[PDB]
Structure 1
Amino acid sequence: KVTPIVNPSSYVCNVCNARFSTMSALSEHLRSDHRPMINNAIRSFLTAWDDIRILSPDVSSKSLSAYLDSAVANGPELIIEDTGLCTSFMLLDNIPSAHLTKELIGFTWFMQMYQMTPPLPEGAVNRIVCMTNWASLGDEGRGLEVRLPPPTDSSVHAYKTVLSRGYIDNAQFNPLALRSNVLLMLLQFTLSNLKINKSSTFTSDVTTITSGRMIRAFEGRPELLALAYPGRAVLPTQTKNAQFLSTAIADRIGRLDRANLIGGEVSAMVECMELCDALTLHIRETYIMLLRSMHQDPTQIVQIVNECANNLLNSTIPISLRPTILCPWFASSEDLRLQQVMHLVNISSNTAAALPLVEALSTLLRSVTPLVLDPTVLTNAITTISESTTQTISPISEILRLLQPMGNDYAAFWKCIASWAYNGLVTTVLSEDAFPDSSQSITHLPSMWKCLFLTLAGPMTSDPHSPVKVFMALANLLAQPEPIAIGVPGMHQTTPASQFSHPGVWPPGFLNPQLINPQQAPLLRAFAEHIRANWPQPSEFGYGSTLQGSANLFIPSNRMVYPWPNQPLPRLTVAPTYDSAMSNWISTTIAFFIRVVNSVNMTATVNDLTRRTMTGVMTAMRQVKTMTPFYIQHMCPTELSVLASVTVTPPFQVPFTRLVQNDVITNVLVARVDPAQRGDAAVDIRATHATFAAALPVDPAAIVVAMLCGQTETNLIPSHHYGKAFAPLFASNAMFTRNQRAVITREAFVCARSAVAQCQDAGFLVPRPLDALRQFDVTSAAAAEIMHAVNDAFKTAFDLDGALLDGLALYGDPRIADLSAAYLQYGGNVVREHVPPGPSHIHRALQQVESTFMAEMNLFNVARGNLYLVQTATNGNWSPMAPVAAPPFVRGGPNVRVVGRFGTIVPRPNGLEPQLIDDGNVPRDIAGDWVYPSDVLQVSVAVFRDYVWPMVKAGRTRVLVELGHYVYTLHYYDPQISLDEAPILEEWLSKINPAGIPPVPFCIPIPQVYPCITARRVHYAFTSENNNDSLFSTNAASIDTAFGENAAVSPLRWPGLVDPNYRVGTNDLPNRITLYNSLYRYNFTYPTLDGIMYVR
């Protein structure tokens, strides 16, 4: 059938044959027929339901925080431009004058009569309503917006954004969570409005209206050209707009100073005057000021890329001029720290998080390395030692059994290297199944060669208890010949060398080898002499660039500690040398186990000819010319300096420790909550912070193959081989993605911990401009909805996909959001290097919006001041929003009475009037002046409507409704027709719950153009404070308003258009908002790294 063109005028219920004029009437009556205990959950499911809103503070996604390599790899949208004009307030016409009942020729004049669109609205009520981006034709709008309906509508769905869905129904707003809902709208006002002002095109005004002024050329959209420029209005008749637009100064339009640089090239920054509020323009200019803060000039970003690549990459920049080159990619060193902790807060602090993170290096580490493992060399070094085959036990064959993995299993060496950048999260542990057991002796031959493989692979693994496990695995293995004293009791010498993972059970002989007697244990003192002398020195090196900064927390910035005494990278042909600390470590173990093999204990048991075989194997193993001693000292610290800034996470390091008892890093700790707000400032740091329990069981048999048998191509130039391998992973700007992440991680963190502490009472040191507003629910789960919604907005406005700000509610109390980090040493070093947020920009922007919200609350459909309910039966002008008289009966005045907490009428017998309990718990009579608090009237509303509200209609009492700030809904009527406000105002009383109130129905007459006869009418509701701050013009198309107020267009809104004393560049911004300002548009080109530099 044919599709319908118009909605049905009558809606059917089909249950009962009931006609409905409105679908909203059918929406309630179908809901009415659904309604014991069963129908209440059915009615509430249709009551508090809506999913059409963007923000979901009530949907608490449990453990959504999960770090991903692709989550940071998507950068946030920062460069969103605004080709249109940057105002947030459209001049909305509520009541056109065509809706006026009496119409005579010539009283009202329309521009539509002359085939022309008006610059200013033309009706009988013109409000200034907050509708963001109504004129913004910029590319790819910010997602979230706020679009308030005019005051004739309900205008409460913009104020149910948090703490309001399940608690109050649709027709109400929650006044005890009002400061939350208003401020979260202002965040939605700000982040919807973080655009870049872009100059479109500028033609000369060829026509006679301004005669040559460089007009904004809205080419394809003339319906916005007339609205951009009120100065180019045609003023045919004496419209009341034409009364105002006659005062428009002629040269306040178009561009003034095009700051161009290069002839032919697009200009840098024009300076034009057009229609814009003073508030959006402040949000735009602080966004460029944000966007310059991560900009660096191209002479300095080539120093960053070369220092990030350690100056072995061929990146050249042209030396010339480049006009418009915003390349915004540079978070400071402070902001990278704030993301790095936020990286560690999102993750699970077990081994489920570092184990993705190590192989992120180790995949790229094996991709670029020149070190080619080839285990044939150490095989050919051992199988070419001579052994008589007549023996029962072969020391050649019984150690290649303990040497070969079946697969490759050689990337575990490269995971062992890649864990050095991540020793804060994970500590690689010697694999417990590779320790020799506490059953076999030193005469048992494969048990000894395990202890060689542990001692060689000792300094590779980053566990702080590695050398005590190396020392004990031999001290276990010769407990019968050489006994010593082992620490506290319960840990004996035959404890199987894996349970010595605590610093308290290091033996005293290992700390001081003088405590081991050479006359008792000569072979075991010399192994304590071995480890304390030859264990490598924990050196350090730099990475990244000092200009960019780094996400180091405990290491000083742009540095990395390293468990080996490194040397800089050579650029000539390299050869395996024995000057390394590796070769110092390797040769002295073999020099120690040639002593153990040729000791007295092995002499009595092991045959002398097969003892020469073991000596011959290790001396062959010592003389294997392998490149890994040169590699770990020279070539490997270069690529751990390079890959530390191209992997998705910067290295989180904790300083290494060579055998110091008091400097063993027992725990590495990061908290989500500072110990000052909760009373935990003096307790142990393990109770205040969360700890990273991660470990990797590195197999030592695969390390010794990798360590003692590793070679490289003969003609290797290590600058060339690193310069060729690192080139595909610096050509893109994707390296700078985490800098764009870290600022948005900052700007969301500062603004969320503000928005929580704004809604608390005196939380962190944040300024509180909205503290006049009502906020009662300050609990954890209330503030959990606030931070989750701010998180829901920064993930929407910058439309990213990572996990920022999640996991700050892991413990469940985001009222205390402070990021700290620490590590405890066994001596009791309690470092606590905690990181505050940086000097953010959007937190300065929201703070300015909140300050200028308070001066113009009425502009956002929120009235301030109390509420008056007196019977005012008048005939003339009636202005509830602007009470021209003095506000009667202020609180505490002459015999004005304040109701106590219950709102309790006591009944009196035998014709006596019912008394009302006041604040002093005294029943006082109804007739008189009363003040009701808002919360008393929320629970006494049936007692109000039945006992003291009919006393208001009789005019014998007057009730003040004391409440701070409130959403108002205006109602209009033809004043020629009679009206009584009580059917309009009892509908307000009929929906006041104990949970929330509806917006307040003020009745206002439409201002008439004729001096017409007016009906006597009775009004009840009006306000005390002047709340008429959103009325733009009382009546526009008419020549003159007659009956209503003569509220013409205020020139205070427009200094930039009508004031001769207006200087370019001024605003009264904490006060009222100027709607026509001078500004700056931009023409930034957005180069890639190919547009900056050239990389071969």
Structure 2
Amino acid sequence: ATPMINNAIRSFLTAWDDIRILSPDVSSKSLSAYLDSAVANGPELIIEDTGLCTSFMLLDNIPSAHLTKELIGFTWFMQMYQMTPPLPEGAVNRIVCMTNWASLGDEGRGLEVRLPPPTDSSVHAYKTVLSRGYIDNAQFNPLALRSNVLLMLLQFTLSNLKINKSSTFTSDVTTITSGRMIRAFPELLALAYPGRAVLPTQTKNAQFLSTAIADRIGRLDRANLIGGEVSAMVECMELCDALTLHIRETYIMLLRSMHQDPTQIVQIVNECANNLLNSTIPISLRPTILCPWFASSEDLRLQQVMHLVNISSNTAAALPLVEALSTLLRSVTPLVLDPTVLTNAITTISESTTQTISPISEILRLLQPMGNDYAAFWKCIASWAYNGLVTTVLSEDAFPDSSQSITHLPSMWKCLFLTLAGPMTSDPHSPVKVFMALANLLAQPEPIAIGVPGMHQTTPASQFSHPGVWPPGFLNPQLINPQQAPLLRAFAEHIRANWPQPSEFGYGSTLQGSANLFIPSNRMVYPWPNQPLPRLTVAPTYDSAMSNWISTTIAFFIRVVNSVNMTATVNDLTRRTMTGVMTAMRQVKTMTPFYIQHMCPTELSVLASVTVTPPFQVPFTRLVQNDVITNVLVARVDPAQRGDAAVDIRATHATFAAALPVDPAAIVVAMLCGQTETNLIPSHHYGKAFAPLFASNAMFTRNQRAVITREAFVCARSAVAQCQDAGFLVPRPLDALRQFDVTSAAAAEIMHAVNDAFKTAFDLDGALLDGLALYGDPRIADLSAAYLQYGGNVVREHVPPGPSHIHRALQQVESTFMAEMNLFNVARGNLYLVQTATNGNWSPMAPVAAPPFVRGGPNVRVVGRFGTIVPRPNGLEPQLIDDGNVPRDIAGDWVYPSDVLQVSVAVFRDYVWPMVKAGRTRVLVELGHYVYTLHYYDPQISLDEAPILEEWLSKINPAGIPPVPFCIPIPQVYPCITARRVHYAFTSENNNDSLFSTNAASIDTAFGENAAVSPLRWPGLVDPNYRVGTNDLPNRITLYNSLYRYNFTYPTLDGIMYVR
């Protein structure tokens, strides 16, 4: 335990702080890839803000003195009149960004920034990213200022996404306004209406408040519809600001862009339920409802491809979705499996009890009663909505095995049960496998040609799983000659002419939208043809496509069992039983072939709009060699920026590999032997079953979360590509601020901040937008999805983000940030260090006249990239190696850029800094933007700024710099015999945009600066030419505008319609 450990312990102590203040700590990537568990809880969108919609607190910084003995009457506090002043009256009154300082409304969002005043440090709102463990406690990182400022504004534009809400506008019976109905409250009543203040003596506040117009207060024109009910929206003027109002107005515009009328919502519900769920709406005016429930389909396609990314790519993804759908499917179906009917139709075939092999016994043997409740039929029905994901392969154990001819009666029925349960599986190569099972079963009498070398006819049929190894006799039955294979040509003719042609039907509503990626929107595909749902009493039919497929494979295996190579070995009595069993199997009055063609699509098209995951389907393709979907693959990386412009889509995209094994003998029983109740109206039995699933608006939770995953995928594509140098087509208003660490490691730490901001602001708790940083590169995160058919025709379906709204809210915060950075304690310009021994007033932030020596000026030499100093011998001054690498002497004017000063503060502080305070040289510190800190002082006293500046150089590391300190005199209310102070640091551009007023209480500022209350931030109060509106937003932040107070009511689903 020496120095090696000691540094770590000390390092660890300093770099601990993110376990306290920051709710969102970037990239503690313990749990990077996080699973989208099927319990989406939905976000909270509706938060009232009954307080005043402002975010810039006028802060009483340095307080005016309570001087009472000498010089009375210079200050006039409003506290001596038992009243609170609307404007702060200290000796300096800074404006600062303190989010939701006056938001006493309902609830709170959390995640709110609050800059301390510039007298304090304020370098703990710019250490949100890339500053833990690199930097220490009292520094800000200038190489990553842009990435930290952008996240600081992202918490600014998220903590303000509330809804304005009116309080009770009482009248004002006192004599200050006389009847002007203001918005009454209990402390920010005099503080929200500056025009309402009683003005005693002519204070420095009062000579601005005396110019307040007397009708720019309170409500303006309330627009109530129904007389007696609560109003709709009320336009009122109070202390807000144009920046916070625009973020708060673009959020009500967000909610009005996902709410539809009661005649629109009811239609959507009916469309979702395929018109059986019966609901009525009252045709009467509900004047104030806002139901933020319906996202557009362009955002819903993004939520779907997001929920395919942050989920395990393998078999783990398919199971929850299928099982969840299966449970509903089994629960609401009218069809009841009852395998006694198949049993009583088979066992009553009179066989003889003298043969050693009972055919009847054998078929029953394989078909089993293992306790299976035949969910494998419903795990093969529910796996049709997800055939892009999970494909139902026939089970490898259930094939008729090789080394077993067609004489083998257990290996004969397994070939039959594979054929009947062929197209129930949603497998592309199943047809080949079903055909293969028989062709490998009698590979002695009937030799065909297998298309490749590497496998033969007696290869096990499970291996026929590639599209290329389909036998050419099966792709074209004319190649099989009936002189050699009379039985195997008839199977390839039977498969190609009785397999069910795929069809389509509609699900959901076309107003709400659909998350179908590859199919056209609000359309589902189906491996059998469909008919509309009947409202009559139903009976088992035989003219369906399933009952035709059943009664053709049975009619084929009758021809098999009465062949020539079959009649040779098996006795002539037992093949009468085998023909007797199959002919009694095709004539079983089963309800299931009617169920597939009719009831199950209307069963599927309702459950696909109530599940937690919308159906991801790919187009079905029977029997086509060139159009078998080999891969369905989803990309999380834009391949045009990855260099991968033209490689195949199996490489740039990630393939789904799920395969639910199903058994034929558990399907064939449910296929051949389902029945229903006699008096069964299918439309009645679904309306009795689909009524609890549409009972309330929890169906629109998947719909509501798709807005956030739209609006958090844009702000994690904006903020990543706006930090790093020239990314996507995102505008960069933050671009003068320095950003050096543009690496892929830093881009994950910014996305982890935007992910953890949206996960905290809306409180949604799934795994929103966490999928992308799985490959480690989030600076090229663009979603896509495609499927590559075997012919090569790959359907590339780009999914772009929708036209979001908080994209153009964050682009409005950063646009007005570059004019009002001093309100956020950032400063522009540079930093000078000349010796100035002023006796009068001093003003570092607001310099008068021209600055001395701007770069490139005559005799202004720039320090080189090292900042190195060559010592000269025997009594010469040590020169400084300049930018042109020729050692100029120190006594002059220097430009010292902050990157050079960060690696040379042991050379600055010993050599060129003693030539600053000796009045010999004047350096420039060329840093782009910085946090500033204002240490005030009593001006009538001795004060040297050299120990403050020597403290500032001692904290400068190769890591970051501390915030720049400036000594500013406290403005006194009387002429004072001021001592001559020696100052050094003063900025170049006018960074004094936040001094709201100085010594406001006083009667007049008599020394420091009389920066009185500027009426450019207040033209809603003190201007004659002011109109309603006129929020000159980009240029400056107003402070008194006419806003709107909405008074919505948010009903449930039972508040809109009636559902029974």
- TM class by smaller structure: over 0.9
| Pair 894,227 (structure 1): closer, same or farther in 2 beyond 3 Å | same
| Alignment deviations for residues 449-492 of structure 1 (CA, whole Å, 9 cap, x no partner) | 00111000000000100000000000000000100000110111
SS at match of 1:255: strand
Q: 1:216-241 deviations in whole A, cap 9, x for unaligned? A: 011xxx21101100010110001111
1: CA distance, partners of 2:815 / 2:568: 90
TM-aligned CA distance change 1:77 to 1:57, over 3 Å: closer
My pick for the range that moved more, 62-71 or 418-427, is 62-71
Given candidates 379, 403, 409, the residue that maps to 1:439 is 403
State the TM-score, normalized to the length of structure 1: 0.96
Structure 1 unaligned runs (5+)? Answer: 1-35
Q: Distance in 1 between matches of 2:953 and 2:735?
A: 28
CA offsets 1:406-450 (integer angstroms, 9 cap, x no match):
112401110100000000111000000000111111001110100
Separation in 1, partners of 2:43, 2:574:
68
Q: 2:23–2:111: 8 Å Cα contact kept in structure 1?
A: no
Contact 1:175 1:774 in 2 (8 A): yes
Deviations along 1:481-534, whole A, 9 cap, x unmatched?
A: 100000110111011100110000000001000010111101000000000000
Question: What is the distance in 1 between the residues matched to 2:959 and 2:1020?
Answer: 45
SS state at 2:520 partner: coil
Taking structure 1 as reference, are residues 335 and 100 closer, same or farther at Cα in structure 2, changes over 3 Å only? farther
1:51 CA drift (Å): 3.0
Q: CA deviation at 1:60?
A: 3.7
Deviation at residue 200 of structure 1 after TM alignment: 0.6
Take 2:257 and 2:598, find their aligned partners in 1: how far apart are those partners? 37
Alpha-carbon contact 2:48-2:105 (below 8 Å) kept: yes
Query: 1:141 deviation in Å?
Result: 1.1
- 1:49 CA drift (Å): 0.7
1:780 aligns with 2:744: yes
Distance 1:63 1:432 in 2: 40
Distance 1:815 1:45, change over 3 A: same
Q: Does the 8 Å CA contact 1:65/1:803 hold for their aligned counterparts?
A: no
Call closer, same or farther: CA 1:61–1:478 in 2, change over 3 Å. farther
Per-residue deviation, 1:757: 0.3
How far did residue 102 of structure 1 move?
8.2
Give 1:52 deviation, angstroms: 4.5
The SS at the match of 2:713 is helix
> Partner residue of 1:340?
304
Give the Å deviation of 1:73: 3.2
Q: Note the C-alpha offset of 1:55.
A: 4.4
Contact 2:631/2:787 (8 A) holds in 1: yes
**Which range moved further: 579-588 or 62-71?**
62-71
Give the deviation of 1:564 after TM superposition.
0.5
1:805 Cα shift?
Answer: 1.1
What percent identity do the matched residue pairs reach? 100
- The counterpart of 1:989, out of the listed 932, 953, 956, is 953
- Matches of 2:586 and 2:746, distance apart in 1: 67
Kept in 2: contact 1:73–1:734 (CA 8 A)? no
Q: Deviations over 1:324-376 (max 9, x none)?
A: 10011011000010000000010111000111110110000011000000000
Q: Indicate conservation of the 8 Å contact 2:498/2:548, yes or no.
A: yes
Decide whether the 8 Å contact of 1:572 with 1:718 is kept in 2.
yes
The Cα shift of 1:59 comes to 5.9
Whole-Å separation in 2 of the counterparts to 1:775 and 1:1056? 38
Greater CA drift, 93-102 or 362-371: 93-102
The change in CA–CA distance for 1:47 and 1:414 in structure 2 (over 3 A counts) is: same
What's the offset of the Cα at 1:61? 5.4
User: Do 1:93 and 1:123's aligned partners in 2 also have CA atoms closer than 8 Å?
Assistant: yes
Where structure 2 has 5 or more consecutive residues not aligned to the other structure, the ranges are: none
CA distance in 1, matches of 2:68, 2:1017: 31
Match of 1:142 in 2: 109
TM-score scaled by length of structure 2: 0.99
Q: 2:23 and 2:402 mapped to 1: Cα distance?
A: 60
**Whole-angstrom distance in 2 between the partners of 1:911 and 1:763:** 55
- Partner in structure 2 of residue 543 of structure 1: 507
| 2:54–2:240 contact (8 Å) kept in structure 1 | yes
1:67–1:343: 8 Å Cα contact kept in structure 2? no
Q: Report if the CA contact (8 A) 1:191-1:797 is conserved.
A: yes
Is the 2:35–2:312 Cα contact (8 Å) retained in structure 1? no
CA distance in 2, matches of 1:487, 1:100: 105
Task: Tell whether the 8 Å contact from 2:47 to 2:108 is kept in structure 1 after alignment.
Answer: yes
Q: CA deviation at 1:69?
A: 7.8
Secondary structure at the aligned position of 1:377 is classed as helix
Distance across 2 between alignment mates of 1:593 and 1:743? 56
Distance 2:200 2:19 in 1: 45
1:844-865 C-alpha deviation (Å, 9 max, x unpaired): 1000000000010111000000
Q: Distance in 2 between matches of 1:823 and 1:782?
A: 33
1:934-958 Cα distance to aligned partner (Å, 9 max, x none) = 1000001110000000100001100
- The whole-number CA distance in structure 2 between the counterparts of 1:760 and 1:456 is 60
Q: Distance in 2 between matches of 1:909 and 1:744?
A: 69
- In 1, the alpha carbon distance for the partners of 2:358 and 2:982 equals 114
Structure 1 contact 57–162 (Cα < 8 Å) conserved: no
Whether the 8 Å CA contact 2:845–2:987 is kept in 1: the answer is yes
Q: CA contact under 8 A between 1:903 and 1:937: conserved in structure 2?
A: yes
User: Contact between 2:637 and 2:781, CA under 8 Å: does it hold in 1?
Assistant: yes
Work out the CA distance in 1 between the residues paired with 2:91 and 2:11: 40
Q: Deviations over 1:1038-1085 (max 9, x none)?
A: 000000111000000000000010001111100111100001001100
Aligned residue pairs total 1058
Task: Tell me the CA shift for residue 53 of structure 1.
Answer: 4.7
Residues 57 and 80 of structure 1: CA distance in aligned 2, closer, same or farther (over 3 Å): closer
Contact 2:36 2:307 in 1 (8 A): no
Call closer, same or farther: CA 1:1067–1:595 in 2, change over 3 Å: same
SS, match of residue 125 in structure 2:
helix
Alignment map for 1:952-1031 (pairs within 5 Å): 952-1031=916-995
> SS of the counterpart of 1:311?
coil
Is residue 378–residue 621 contact of structure 1 (8 Å, CA) maintained in 2? Answer: yes
Aligned pairs for 1:629-778 within 5 A:
629-778=593-742
Alpha-carbon offset, residue 63 of structure 1? 7.4
Query: Partners of 2:221 and 2:31 in 1: how far apart?
Result: 50
The residue matched to 2:827 in structure 1 has which SS? strand
Going from structure 1 to structure 2, the CA distance change for 1:160 and 1:59 (only over 3 Å counts) comes to: closer
CA 1:409–1:439: 2 relative to 1, 3 Å = farther
Is the contact made by 1:72 and 1:741 (CA closer than 8 Å) also made in structure 2?
A: no
Aligned mates of 2:880, 2:369 — CA distance in 1: 91
In the superposition, relative to structure 1, how do residues 200 and 57 fare at CA in structure 2: closer, same or farther (>3 Å)?
closer
User: How far does residue 691 in structure 1 lie from its aligned partner after superposition?
Assistant: 0.5
Deviation per residue, 1:122-167 (Å, 9 max, x gap): 1100000000000001222111000000000000000000001111
Secondary structure of the equivalent of 2:42? coil
The structure-2 alpha-carbon separation of the partners of 1:58 and 1:237, relative to structure 1 and needing over 3 Å to count, comes to closer
Change (3 A) 1:923 1:56: farther
1:920 aligns with 2:884: yes
**Distance in 2 (alpha carbons) for counterparts of 1:998 and 1:528:** 81
Distance 1:739 1:115 in 2: 54
Query: Taking structure 1 as reference, are residues 115 and 99 closer, same or farther at Cα in structure 2, changes over 3 Å only?
Result: closer
Say whether the 8 Å CA contact 2:278–2:1059 is kept in structure 1: yes
Preserved contact between residue 905 and residue 915 of structure 1 (Cα < 8 Å)? yes
Cα distance, 1:99 vs structure 2: 6.9
Alignment check: 8 A CA contact 2:25 2:128 kept: no
Counterparts of 1:113 and 1:640 in 2: how far apart (Å)?
76
Shift of 1:56: 6.5
Say whether the 8 Å CA contact 1:82–1:197 is kept in structure 2.
yes
Cα drift, residue 909 of structure 1: 0.2
Q: Indicate conservation of the 8 Å contact 1:57/1:785, yes or no.
A: no
| 2:407 partner SS | coil
SS at match of 1:605: coil
CA drift at 1:563: 0.3
Aligned with 2:609: secondary structure? coil
**Whole-angstrom CA distance in 2 between matches of 1:954 and 1:1054:** 45
Shift of 1:405: 3.6
Query: 1-side partners of 2:316 and 2:475: how far apart?
Result: 35
Correspondence list, 1:442-457, <5 A: 442-457=406-421
Q: Give me the whole-angstrom Cα distance separating, in 1, the residues matched to 2:8 and 2:565.
A: 84
The 3-state SS of whatever aligns with 1:514 is coil
* SS of residue in 2 equivalent to 1:522: coil
- The answer to whether the Cα contact below 8 Å between 2:49 and 2:105 also exists between their aligned partners in 1 is yes
- Stretch of structure 1 that moved more, 852-861 or 60-69: 60-69
Q: Secondary structure at the match of 1:51?
A: helix
1:959 and 1:690, CA in 2 relative to 1: closer, same or farther beyond 3 A?
Answer: same
